[PDB]
Symmetry: C3
Subunit: 336 residues, 3 copies
């Protein structure tokens, strides 16, 4: 009565994909929550596989290249992440979902790269307020966390400037394998690329007009019509509304409600094809103490949903009754 | 043009059903709001019938029994509450709704017991994030506010350990008479009992998929198909989302919006069968000052809705016009 | 690919329509946001036309008349506003929308008066938690911001007491030209007038039962069935829920979500008939610093939506490519 009985947990404290310090504390934010306990109580065995140590070079070793900030730290980290994720996914080759906690969203390049190595025909569900598909010369900031998909999408490779250290980062995604949910702050060039190459996307406008139920169904239909493909669920916490997840770097008003987020994860989990879920952009150094607790709370409910937790309840593993303990019940007292 | 023209108000400052101090201040939180004024302005006569004094024994007199905390305080209080509620309901035998403000949710046992004495064929609409139907040996905490329904449901009596002081607490509810709305944190054993005995329930999952309109309709259909039965509306404030009701003991994210809560109450009120509404688990000692004000505010809008307040507006009792005061109108000035 | 390429911006710091100081800082709250920048990035040319200086008389010059507070300041200000708005609308006679930032809602009398002078067959979409249609002798407070529509509606003129200084304020609206969205706190007499004269209105109850999509469609159908008429969008910030717009004078719980507000504005904008949009009741002197930022943020997203900003994204004005800069792409590197 569980689609998944085992699961792996992995921390990736990336903080070089964006300038605000604190995303490196993301994994600890979840580890010090009651997440592991709650999962165990659901009958799921969660193995903490530790953290991936990101490569963080200094200014001298990693200067700007094509406007990109920390691009060599990114490429080295991408490859290290990919190696670890591939290793974990192949050791598990019911399926054993990998739960990844970031860390800024730049980890997704290495995270999907490794995942695809173990499961090449996967699809990606990108839950985010942002496209994260800026090509390097289009990026206004040069922040890597705004470009993780551009290196993975084959159709975009004529817009990615060549770099030797990026050679191992092989584009492993077709535009037809990605679906967006929650978009509300696209750069114009992202909009151009998404429409041009036919990437399936459902913005908050769509969520408003169609309702989250139809959006989820349409998204899954677009990139995984018969539930044949493994699912890579890349969940940016900023997809949720700032009212429920304020502690994140680029909050955008009018987001998914926690319930809507729960629905996406519940449906994805119930397909039986959840292979990797990653939660990005938690920053416990942002906002007040209560802000952090709200964000942590949302993250925990979201992740529990991915592993199959059901708001409609779970049956107990052993039903208990009074007679076994030698205890008189009220019904048994009235019968006498 | 009012389904109810009179109503009674009753405070029950129960605080022995759960360990956090402050639920005893719940009634005062509402009394010091503009609730009474707003009700009067709607043309409803509200009579404050005072407070029920709970029985609060000391540690020596009330030790743990079957893991339960303050179980004798509970049983004595249950009977005292039942006596008062029965008395009030029979004095009113248009109907005169009883509005009850808690106080933690353990009051419901005595509150429904008394109500059923005056109206035996009633149905219960339980609006809560929790089932509140833990049997004593299944309760993790032993807190009485997590068990008020288990003593009332006939089908559960083989799971309730017998106690002499509990004899007067006669199970007066059939499983088929209860409907849940808003559930999102069921203990596994509660889930077992609810499904086993066929108790109608609609979780936040259901609210998401069906919409609150259909859920309300289905709930009423399940336990009161032809509006024949009196309604006992037991409203736990924690059913609402923590964003609108943070000042409560066991807040759970992803709850009913205030509007959804208003819809439940508006529909229940409009049946003409609202006999008792109780609002439980207000704790003004929890959260910030603004938190308390938000929670108080939500409580007031919820309770006003129960008494028949309409967001679409009310007609005035006497329409006024300029000519009666000897005043020249603009239309009357232009005619000259 | 833009319905509007030009737009005018206008501040009206009215603060004599209600007793709480700070609505006069409303325009500055928006001017010091990134509103202008964001609009420019959408390809729209926004011309700041400055502020209208309200007439603010002293106590001696402006005593109570028929219970009204600052009624002569109101009438003088109404006429000054009307003169400026008419002038701006006729200079623009694609259409050039006028964006007005208040200021309390009493500005609407002069604002609609001037607008109607330039476009007599307009319709009004009133987005507010309140009717703002109290007639002077019915007003409990005498605050002008609760009466701006009563002076404009022809059918109400037998309920408006005549005043010499109000003669120039000619009622230019028929009841059939106004539609309400978002109502949840009507005075009884307002309810009487709205129902009596057949003013189209959709309360939060309607929004709950019908959904915002149907409400918007029905509202537009009621007062602008074939998109023939110019639209006057009068947006009271208190229409939105206090959770997203706390910094306002008369907040009422259970309001429109930001998304619902965005939907109203998006639809109105897309008709191509948005002639004037005004945003009223911003008060940055109310609430905490974060409260002000939330309210400012909501205001900015709302106003951007009115000018045609699309959450589904915009195409760039010039698509850029690597070859023009003499840069080697990854696709161009692999081909060699
Ligand atoms: Mn994002
Ligand atoms: Mn992202
Ligand atoms: Mn509860
Ligand atoms: Mn409860
Ligand atoms: Mn208002
Ligand atoms: Mn207003």
């Amino acid at each position: 009565k569980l689609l998944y009985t085992s699961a792996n947990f992995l921390g990736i404290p990336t903080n070089r994909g964006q300038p605000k310090i604190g995303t490196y504390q993301g994994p600890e934010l979840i580890r010090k929550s009651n997440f592991f306990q709650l999962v165990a109580e659901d009958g799921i065995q969660l193995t903490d596989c530790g953290d991936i140590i990101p490569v963080e070079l200094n200014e001298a070793e990693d200067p700007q290249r094509f406007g990109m900030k920390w691009s060599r730290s990114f490429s080295l980290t991408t490859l290290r992440i990919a190696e670890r994720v591939e290793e974990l996914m192949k050791q598990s080759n019911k399926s054993t979902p990998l739960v990844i906690v970031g860390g800024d969203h730049s980890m997704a390049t290495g995270t999907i790269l490794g995942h695809a190595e173990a499961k090449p025909d996967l699809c990606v569900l990108w839950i985010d307020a942002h496209g994260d598909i800026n090509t390097p010369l289009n990026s206004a900031s040069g922040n890597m966390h705004g470009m993780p998909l551009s290196f993975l999408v084959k159709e975009l490779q004529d817009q990615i400037p060549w770099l030797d250290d990026f050679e191992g980062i092989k584009p492993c995604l077709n535009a037809s394998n990605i679906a967006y949910i929650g978009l509300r702050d696209l750069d114009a060039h992202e909009t151009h690329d998404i429409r041009k190459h036919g990437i399936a996307y459902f913005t908050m406008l769509d969520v408003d007009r169609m309702g989250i139920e139809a959006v989820i169904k349409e998204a899954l239909l677009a990139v995984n019509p018969r539930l044949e493909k493994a699912i890579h669920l890349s969940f940016d916490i900023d997809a949720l509304d700032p009212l429920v997840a304020p502690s994140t770097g680029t909050a955008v008003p009018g987001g998914l409600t926690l319930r809507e987020g729960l629905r996406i994860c519940e449906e994805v989990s119930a397909t039986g094809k959840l292979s990797v879920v990653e939660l990005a952009e938690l920053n416990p150094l942002l906002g007040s103490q209560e802000d952090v607790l709200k964000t942590q709370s949302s993250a925990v409910h979201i992740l529990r949903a991915c592993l199959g937790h059901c708001r409609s309840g779970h049956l107990p593993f052993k039903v208990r009754n009074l007679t076994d303990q030698g205890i008189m019940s009220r019904a048994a007292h009235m019968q006498t």
